[PDB]
Paper text:
In support of this goal, we map the epitope of human monoclonal antibody 9H2 which is able to neutralize the three serotypes of poliovirus. Here, we solved the high-resolution structures of 9H2 fragments of antibody binding (Fab) complexed with live and inactivated poliovirus serotypes 1, 2, and 3 capsids. For each of the Fab-virus complexes, we find that the binding site overlaps with the poliovirus receptor (PVR) binding site and maps across and into a depression in the capsid called the canyon. Thus, 9H2 outcompetes the receptor to neutralize poliovirus.
To make complexes, 9H2 antibody fragments (Fab) were generated and purified from the mAb and incubated in excess with virus capsids of wild-type PV1 and 2 (WTPV1, WTPV2), Sabin PV3 (SPV3), and Sabin inactivated PV1, 2, and 3 (SIPV1, SIPV2, SIPV3). The α-carbon root mean square deviation (Cα-RMSD) was 0.7, 0.4, and 0.4 Å for live virus serotypes 1, 2, and 3, respectively. Strong pocket factor density, equal in magnitude to capsid density was observed in both inactivated and live types 2 and 3 virus-Fab complexes; however, there was no PF density resolved at any contour level in either the inactivated or live type 1 virus-Fab complexes. The 9H2 footprint overlaps that of PVR but seems to trigger pocket factor release only from serotype 1, indicating that 9H2 lacks contacts essential to PVR function in serotypes 2 and 3. One local difference was seen in WTPV1 at a VP1 loop comprised of residues 232–238. Among the live virus 9H2 footprints, there is one unique contact for serotype 1, VP1 L234, that overlaps with the receptor-binding site. When considering the live virus-Fab complexes, VP1 L234 is found only in the serotype 1 footprint and is critical to PF release. Wild type 1 Mahoney, was captured using purified rabbit antibody that did not interact with either 9H2 or PVR. 9H2 mAb was able to outcompete sPVR, which was already bound to the virus. Consistent with this finding, sPVR was unable to outcompete and replace 9H2 mAb that bound virus first.
Residue numbers in the entry:
A (entry chain 4): 2 to 10, 24 to 66
B (entry chain H): 23 to 148
C (entry chain 2): 9 to 272
D (entry chain L): 21 to 129
E (entry chain 3): 1 to 235
F (entry chain 1): 21 to 302
């Protein structure tokens, strides 16, 4: 039961996990980005004509 | 085997200590100095590393004690630039060559003192 | 309504300011109680709520031309502050978020700026080139009085009676990180022309879901003059800075006999 | 400054005795480079225990030691008359300085 | 049945591989992760945060708190520059130790628009205007204000709002730009000039300071990793 | 959007004359304006093909780093000195580069993939070359009995994980799951292990500042299994730590001054990170 995923330029690469425990797994990559607003967060949101 | 020099007695003025060792242990391993006042117990003085000439001094004697090395005869010299009545003691040159099993700061091997010289007495009084 | 005017009220206390910037919630997560999916201890937690969550006031501090910057450690600063301090000293495990509110009012003719930084795990350096990590608990926890940064490093030369004190250099932020990159932490800047107050709501950040408050400080607050105070009179101008703190959503789990640490 | 030790200890032959060396924080506590030395009158020191419980070649098995907290102790089981002499504690004190103990005079009754 | 071919490059330890491997502690029950505030997924998120520029770096003022504040004054107007930067964020010493510079020192190649922000720390009665400008490379650096008008710039009026931002648009002869001081890839020049002198009434300080910051925009990117140059271990 | 998705495209912007001012802001708020270059400059519409894939946190720690150099030998049979087995308290704090990389952040979880590279060499004029040696590696978790001699009962590996490496083989590898007692590792610990009480003596209550645990990850031990060869062979083992499936939870500014000891102290004299350059000179 292999896991197949696409390479970015399409071609698909295949992987099989050969071990029981999750520490043995390969680094899957494919991580998810996030909005950087959580490090720039006042209580109110304004884009234009900001008050001090 | 390790050899050491004579015994001095003059008051106040500086005194030079001499210690000689085999070439292999001299080049490979550090040399330590320890003093033994009568019945008072051992007291570390400093560390010489002739492999790299990095020298570290005990904070009690940081000013007065000075050390230097000689590769040609495999000899190290310690000089006490000034003396006091407290310095009337028996001094020991020693070599550290028995390694510890524990890795020191992840990059070096610790060595305990294992070979001790015969030592030299020194007196400070009129 | 206007963003410049703000009112906060926790418990039986309230702060009102007419020259406030918009409040900052550090890392975008409001303080909250323990969720059942994340609670390690099994004993019933105490939830004092109004009994502890009010704005206490630390010692007042004088800002001058020659001054250097100041720092505080939380919850250690609140150890003398009423029932929160008593609950902290009586229990073993506890947690709490904080609303730090800094007030430093000055007229329009003054100039200067303070950087209010909130540093998780605010470690600091020792007063000796030798004897690393030797700073004692008495010196490491100044309490409400806080501690002062220094403009230079001068190690203790006398090992026969070591002080075991801190010696945090100001431009290195006391820990060896350059001051210009201190803005990575949650922050608000006082400019005396812009705003007379700043406030940070700090959630409970720690590797453990709940932790021993007497042993461990979660946050540290650094007040550093990014630009010096100045005024028309050459005769040493001075203004006060006041730091006020309100615990939020505090919990204390395990109860024991009173802790009496050797601060004396 | 120096590591603490008892001034003197005594016991009859065949007894088991313990010499205690209590250092400060850092010192015996943080590091494991704790060693013991022995010295008869008119002789240079001799190493008897170099790591916490490790014995050098040529030293009899009746010497033993262990560590706990800021304290490490040398235990001599089956004390014999030839063991009379001075015993010194030694350790590593934080960044790159070294310290001896005050020493203990062990006398066989 | 299957026989096997031993490809070249077997039995090597590539120090950036992604192979599997056996577990030391089998059937270990790992503790669950709690939702600690402040999870970072990409270091570009950490790059898009303002951090102060050590502008001054003079001989006496270096390695002191005075590095971060540039001293303006109410002197008679002249066309000379207040401050200047070379915009090589990893290699310029003024920009290298910023957090953006710290991240960029771990990478060879970078792209996207920087944005510079400035904060006025003088009294509320003080007023004035400052020209902040960016010159793309391939010309003499500006030394008088008449030269700097021709580039990209913003006229910042020091009013009730404390601070203003200049975005430096991504003008480049390559899709990415080197972090070393490669002459082919130089970012340009940034300088700040008095459009008008800062006028302050009587019984007020005659000198005042401006702080300044750098941060990335949403366009920012870096690809190839390296080892940093700042730290040295000895003895 | 996954990390390999493209960045947002820059929309075209024409000239503007209105009250909608984006350029002014207030740093005192602690925010920074989320501007795009179209909003304060006249800009062309361009599709953007760059991506933040290679700035992922998983990609940042892919490059494994050295953490120790343990020294081992098998002395000549005629010698009186003992065989040097090596014991290493496991920690990342002693090599500056990985320490800086990890101390970018405050708390982190990561599975450790350890790789051991072994090298050996002779130490005397004689050429009685020794046969291919075999090296044992042993995980000694906290509180387990550390060995004293090279042939003690402790090396029987009844419960300890262990690896046997033959020289000339490819380097040995083993994966360790997240073994921290807490929900995440704490690279900094702003506290103490024991607090001094009024009842306690001065000696009893003391503890080190920042010493979260005196034995956190465990202990690693290594020996040569072979008996005394007639010629002295010495060896050095290099351990490489490769974080895997890493998550981090609070950024911090990286360090400037040159590191000193396990803590965050700094040495006298070397507190000068910056160097001279005139303000007026490009």
């Amino acid at each position: 039961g292999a896991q197949v995923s696409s390479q970015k330029v399409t071609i698909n690469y295949t992987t099989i996990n050969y071990y029981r425990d999750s520490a043995s797994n390969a680094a899957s990559k494919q991580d998810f980005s996030q909005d950087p607003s959580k490090f720039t967060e006042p209580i109110k949101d304004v884009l234009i004509k900001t008050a001090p | 085997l390790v050899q050491s020099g004579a015994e001095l007695k003059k008051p106040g003025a500086s005194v030079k200590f001499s210690c000689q060792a085999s070439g292999f242990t001299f080049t490979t391993y550090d040399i330590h100095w320890v003093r033994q006042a009568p019945g008072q117990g051992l007291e570390w003085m400093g560390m010489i590393s002739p492999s790299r000439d990095s020298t570290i001094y005990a904070q009690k004697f940081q000013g007065r004690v000075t050390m230097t090395s000689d590769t040609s005869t495999s000899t190290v010299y310690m000089e006490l630039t000034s003396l006091r009545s407290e310095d009337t003691a028996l001094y020991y040159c020693a070599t550290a060559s028995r390694p510890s099993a524990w890795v020191f700061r992840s990059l070096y091997t610790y060595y305990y003192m294992d070979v001790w010289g015969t030592g030299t007495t020194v007196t400070v009084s009129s | 309504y206007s963003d410049r005017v703000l009112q906060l009220t926790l418990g039986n206390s309230t702060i009102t300011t007419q020259e406030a910037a918009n409040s900052v919630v550090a890392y975008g997560r409001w303080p909250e109680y323990l969720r059942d999916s994340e609670a390690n201890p099994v004993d019933q937690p105490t939830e004092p709520d109004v009994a502890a969550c009010r704005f206490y006031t630390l010692d007042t501090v004088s800002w001058t031309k020659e001054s250097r910057g100041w720092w505080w450690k939380l919850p250690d600063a609140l150890r003398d502050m009423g029932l929160f301090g008593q609950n902290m000293y009586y229990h073993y495990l506890g947690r709490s978020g904080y609303t730090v509110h800094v007030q430093c009012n000055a007229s329009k003719f003054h100039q200067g700026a303070l950087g209010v930084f909130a540093v998780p795990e605010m470690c600091l350096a020792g007063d000796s080139n030798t004897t690393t990590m030797h700073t004692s608990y008495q010196n490491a926890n100044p309490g409400e009085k806080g501690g002062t940064f220094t403009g230079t490093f001068t190690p203790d030369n006398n090992q026969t009676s070591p002080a075991r004190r801190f010696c945090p250099v100001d431009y290195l932020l006391g820990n060896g990180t350059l001051l210009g990159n201190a803005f990575v932490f949650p922050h608000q800047i006082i400019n005396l022309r812009t705003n007379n107050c700043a406030t940070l709501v700090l959630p409970y950040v720690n590797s453990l879901s709940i932790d021993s408050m007497v042993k461990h400080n979660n946050w540290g607050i650094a007040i550093l003059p990014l630009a010096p105070l100045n005024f028309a009179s050459e005769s040493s101008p001075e203004i006060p800075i006041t730091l006020t703190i309100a615990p939020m959503c505090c919990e204390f789990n395990g109860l024991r006999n009173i802790t009496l640490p050797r601060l004396q | 400054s120096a590591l603490t030790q008892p001034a003197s200890v005594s016991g009859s032959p065949g007894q088991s005795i313990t010499i205690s060396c209590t250092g400060t924080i850092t010192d015996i506590g943080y590091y494991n480079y704790v060693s013991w030395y022995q010295q008869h009158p008119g002789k240079a020191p001799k190493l008897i225990i170099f790591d916490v419980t490790n014995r050098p070649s040529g030293v009899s098995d009746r010497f033993s030691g262990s560590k706990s907290g800021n304290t490490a102790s040398l235990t001599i089981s089956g004390l014999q008359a030839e063991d009379e002499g001075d015993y010194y504690c030694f350790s590593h004190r934080s960044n790159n300085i070294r310290v001896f103990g005050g020493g203990t005079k062990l006398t066989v009754l | 049945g299957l026989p096997v071919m031993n490809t070249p490059g077997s039995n090597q330890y590539l120090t950036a591989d992604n192979f599997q491997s056996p577990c030391a502690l089998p059937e270990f029950d790992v503790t669950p992760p709690i939702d600690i505030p402040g999870e970072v997924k990409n270091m570009m998120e950490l790059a898009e945060i303002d951090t102060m520029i050590p502008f001054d770096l003079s001989a006496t003022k270096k390695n002191t708190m005075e590095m971060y504040r540039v001293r303006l004054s109410d002197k008679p107007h002249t066309d000379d520059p207040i401050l200047c930067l070379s915009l090589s964020p990893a290699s310029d010493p003024r920009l290298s130790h910023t957090m953006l510079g710290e991240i960029l020192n771990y990478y060879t190649h970078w792209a996207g628009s920087l944005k510079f922000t400035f904060l006025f720390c003088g009294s509320m009665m003080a007023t004035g205007k400052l020209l902040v400008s960016y010159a793309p490379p391939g010309a003499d650096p500006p030394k008088k204000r008449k030269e700097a008008m021709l580039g990209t710039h913003v006229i910042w009026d020091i009013g009730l709002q404390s601070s203003c931002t200049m975005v430096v648009p991504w003008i480049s002869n390559t899709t990415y730009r080197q972090t070393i001081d490669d002459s082919f890839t130089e970012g340009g020049y940034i300088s700040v000039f008095y459009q008008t002198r800062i006028v302050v009434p009587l019984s007020t300080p005659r000198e005042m300071d401006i702080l300044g910051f750098v941060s990335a925009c949403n366009d920012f990117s870096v690809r190839l990793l390296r080892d940093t140059t700042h730290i040295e271990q000895k003895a | 959007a996954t990390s390999r998705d493209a960045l947002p495209n820059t929309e075209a912007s024409g000239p503007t004359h209105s009250k909608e001012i984006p350029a002014l802001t207030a740093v005192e708020t602690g925010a920074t304006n989320p501007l795009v270059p179209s909003d304060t400059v006249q800009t062309r519409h361009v599709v953007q093909h760059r991506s933040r894939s290679e700035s992922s946190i998983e990609s940042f720690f892919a490059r494994g780093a050295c953490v120790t150099i343990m020294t081992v030998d098998n002395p000549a049979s005629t010698t009186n000195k003992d065989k040097l087995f090596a014991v290493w308290k496991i920690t990342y704090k002693d090599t500056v580069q990985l320490r800086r990389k990890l101390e970018f952040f405050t708390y982190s979880r990561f599975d450790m993939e350890l790789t051991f590279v072994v090298t050996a060499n002779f130490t005397e004029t004689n050429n009685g070359h020794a046969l291919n040696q075999v090296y044992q590696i042993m995980y000694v978790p906290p509180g387990a009995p550390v060995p004293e001699k090279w042939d003690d009962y402790t090396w029987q590996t009844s419960s300890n994980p262990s690896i046997f490496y033959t020289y000339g083989t490819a380097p040995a590898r083993i994966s360790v799951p997240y073994v921290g007692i807490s929900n995440a590792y704490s690279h900094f610990y702003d506290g103490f292990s024991k607090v001094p009480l009024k009842d306690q003596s001065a000696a009893l209550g003391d503890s080190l500042y920042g010493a979260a645990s005196l034995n956190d990850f465990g202990i690693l031990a290594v020996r040569v299994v072979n008996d005394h060869n007639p010629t002295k062979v010495t060896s050095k083992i290099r351990v490489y730590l490769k974080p895997k499936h890493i998550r981090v939870w609070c950024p911090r500014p990286p360090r400037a001054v040159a590191y000193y000891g396990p803590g965050v102290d700094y040495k006298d004299g070397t507190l000068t990170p910056l160097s001279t350059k005139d303000l007026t000179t490009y």
